[PDB]
């Protein structure tokens, strides 16, 4: 209802505040400079990011009239009705004082008049064009529109006069998300032992509109937790129940339960690799002031390679969780399509989603399958592989801004990748993940059995992978359920990776050095 | 007659139904039969005019108003039952349906006998055989 309810959209809020207040507070200033401002805004971004809230806040803090129009609401199957609705809406808005019209989901009523087939939609597009810009176009009225995909709009609509400026309201950052969270929780009574900073860091990938839903769910959970034994005021209200209210950390954690939980603890061994990864991932975000004073960008790419089931994806998840960034894990074959131009579309969509929410860790598993050597294949599958490889090359390092994205590749055949993905600036770091040693087996046994009721079984592995140890542990747990963890389970479980792979991996590691 | 409830003067269909029910009530516990109710009782989806709503609502309220001493019953006969205003199907307005379906072989023989009992039939007539080949014939 006011500007104090706005969090994270500092620059955009200030911009819109200026554009709407300057010509209303001091028109004489614009007369002195002798021009008029632009009366048009196009908000674009994900849904649930304070668009409507910001519009109504601007309308309320500046005495005006706010008229809401829904996209599908005004659309009519019958002929001659939609444009009449638009005309009457604009007319009644013009009848009031200086007003702010808001068109929500305008892309549903602007199909560009290019690929559209029906006739009503193009007629309503023409009606909008006439209403916004024409003879006697507008007299002291502001128009705002909101959309998710702004490219699916008629180019005639994105012109000066109609929609002069195009503000971008994306996902808020950590500080903006903290502002939003405190804004929502200010009305709520907060019990002690709750810290907003941690709850803002943990809710890394939340758009902002569902933060309010999170708070409401936490309050609902607390009140439901203190109503099973306390009466529901079916006879009379009490005074000892009103006091001692407020949400705690458990309620908010439960609400968050209603993108993986790793805290650098389950990972065992690989100490130097862990140190290098945290070093090269944390400084770009933890302490960027040092980089910007040194005036140099951070390294982004990393590539693991070795035998399978070693913990590559687990390591990626752990590093993603240590930082408050997001995490997009995709498999190689999972993106290919039998159609023409679909795999590259998938790659572009994934990287656009990654760049739209920074910082972000993108994890490409089985990179050999997707980034195969272009070389020579003389086939349609060869053409598709070449096209997808080129799309990767141009999307990882091309005509982009590369604001903050950390690409991490995990492969099993390091020889089947072209010498252009491994170029520094794309996947500069190449770090071989080896098998675990005796001390590494001690570490993995200690970290696997944290919430559960060892050297002898650690020395009885002789070159196994972490997946085998996980299988042993799960079998022991299953037998414990069937029957604390007894020694007989481990004794009977001990009874239940090719050397060639080892040779190949070592060959590539030594040749690389 | 269903489509015969409208009139020429402004707002006379309601008066027509009112006087029809008044005449049906004042004389005796009579029985009134409305033919082709679908013609004056379509689902709201297929209604755009305003006189249709007025006459439908008048018929609804006339149907609901039923004193204990009235002892009058309405007979509806529609061949298009899936396009009726469901408001009439509520309890107290029209609760008892009569699915007059297609007769069987015996029914067809009965109909044949009923219709042929007023004409000079040759001796060779065997209606039983005819009542087995007229598979889909109805009434």
């Amino acid at each position: 209802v006011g500007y104090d309810d706005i969090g994270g959209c500092r620059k955009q809020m200030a911009q819109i505040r200026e554009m709407v207040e300057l010509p209303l507070r001091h028109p004489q200033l614009f007369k002195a400079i002798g021009i008029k401002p632009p009366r048009g805004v196009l908000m674009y971004g994900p849904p649930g990011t304070g668009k409507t809230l910001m519009a109504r806040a601007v309308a309320n803090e500046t005495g005006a009239f706010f008229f809401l129009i829904n996209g599908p609401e005004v659309m009519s199957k019958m002929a001659g009705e939609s444009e009449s609705n638009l005309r009457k809406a604009f007319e009644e808005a013009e009848k009031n004082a200086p007003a702010i019209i808001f068109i929500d989901e305008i892309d549903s009523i602007a199909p560009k008049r290019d690929k559209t087939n029906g006739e009503v939609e193009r007629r309503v597009v023409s009606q909008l064009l006439t209403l916004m810009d024409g003879m006697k176009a507008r007299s002291n009225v502001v128009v705002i529109a909101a959309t998710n995909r702004p490219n699916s709009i008629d180019p005639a609509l994105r012109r000066f006069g109609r929609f002069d400026r195009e503000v971008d309201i994306g996902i808020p950052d950590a500080t903006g998300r903290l502002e939003v969270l405190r804004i929502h929780t200010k009305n709520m009574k907060l019990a002690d032992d709750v810290d907003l900073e941690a709850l803002a860091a943990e809710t890394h990938g939340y758009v902002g509109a569902d933060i309010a839903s999170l708070c409401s769910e936490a309050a609902m959970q607390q009140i439901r937790e203190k109503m099973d034994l306390i009466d529901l005021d079916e006879d009379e209200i009490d005074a000892e129940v009103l006091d001692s209210l407020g949400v705690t950390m458990d309620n908010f954690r439960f609400a968050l339960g209603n993108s993986v939980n790793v805290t650098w603890d389950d990972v065992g061994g690989l100490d130097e690799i862990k140190e290098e990864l945290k070093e090269t991932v944390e400084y770009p975000v933890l302490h960027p002031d040092q980089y910007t004073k040194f005036g140099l960008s951070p390294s982004k790419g990393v590539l693991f390679y070795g035998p399978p089931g070693t913990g590559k994806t687990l390591l990626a998840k752990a590093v993603a969780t240590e930082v408050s960034a997001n995490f997009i894990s995709v498999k190689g074959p999972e993106l290919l399509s039998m159609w023409y131009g679909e795999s590259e579309s998938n790659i572009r969509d994934i990287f656009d989603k990654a760049r739209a929410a920074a910082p972000t860790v993108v994890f490409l598993d089985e990179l050999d399958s997707i980034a195969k050597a272009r070389g020579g294949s003389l086939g349609d599958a060869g053409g598709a592989s070449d096209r997808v490889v080129n799309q990767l090359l141009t999307e990882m390092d091309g005509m982009n801004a590369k604001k903050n994205v950390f690409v991490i590749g995990a492969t099993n055949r390091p020889d089947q990748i072209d010498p252009a993905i491994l170029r520094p600036g794309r996947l500069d770091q190449l770090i071989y993940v080896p098998l675990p040693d005796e001390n590494a087996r001690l570490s993995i046994l200690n970290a696997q059995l944290r919430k559960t009721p060892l050297t002898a079984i650690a020395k009885a592995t002789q070159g196994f992978s972490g997946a085998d140890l996980l299988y042993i542990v799960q079998r022991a747990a299953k037998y414990a359920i069937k029957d604390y963890i007894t020694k007989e389970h481990f004794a009977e479980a001990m009874k239940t990776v090719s050397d060639a792979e080892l040779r190949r991996y070592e060959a590539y590691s030594q040749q690389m050095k | 007659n269903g489509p015969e409830v409208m009139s020429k003067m402004a707002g006379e269909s309601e008066s027509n139904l009112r006087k029809a029910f008044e005449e049906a009530e004042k004389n005796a516990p009579a029985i009134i039969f409305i033919d082709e109710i679908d013609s004056i009782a379509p689902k709201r989806d297929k209604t755009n005019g305003e006189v249709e709503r007025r006459v439908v609502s008048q018929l609804l309220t006339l149907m609901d108003g039923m004193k204990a001493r009235s002892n009058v019953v309405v007979i509806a006969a529609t061949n298009r039952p899936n396009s009726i205003d469901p408001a009439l199907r509520r309890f107290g307005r029209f609760d008892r349906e009569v699915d007059i379906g297609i007769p069987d072989a015996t029914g067809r023989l009965e109909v044949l006998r009923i219709h042929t009992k007023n004409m000079k039939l040759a001796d060779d007539v065997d209606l039983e055989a005819l009542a087995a080949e007229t598979h889909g014939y109805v009434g």
Binding site: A79, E119, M338, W339, Y340, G341 | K8, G49
Partner: peptide, 22 residues
């Protein structure tokens, strides 16, 4: 006296598209 009025606006059609499989 009352009066009636006719109205016939439009309908909805279905198109068919072609694709190119790689």
């Amino acid at each position: 006296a009352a009066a009636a009025a006719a109205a016939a606006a439009a309908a909805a059609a279905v198109a068919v598209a072609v694709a190119v499989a790689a």
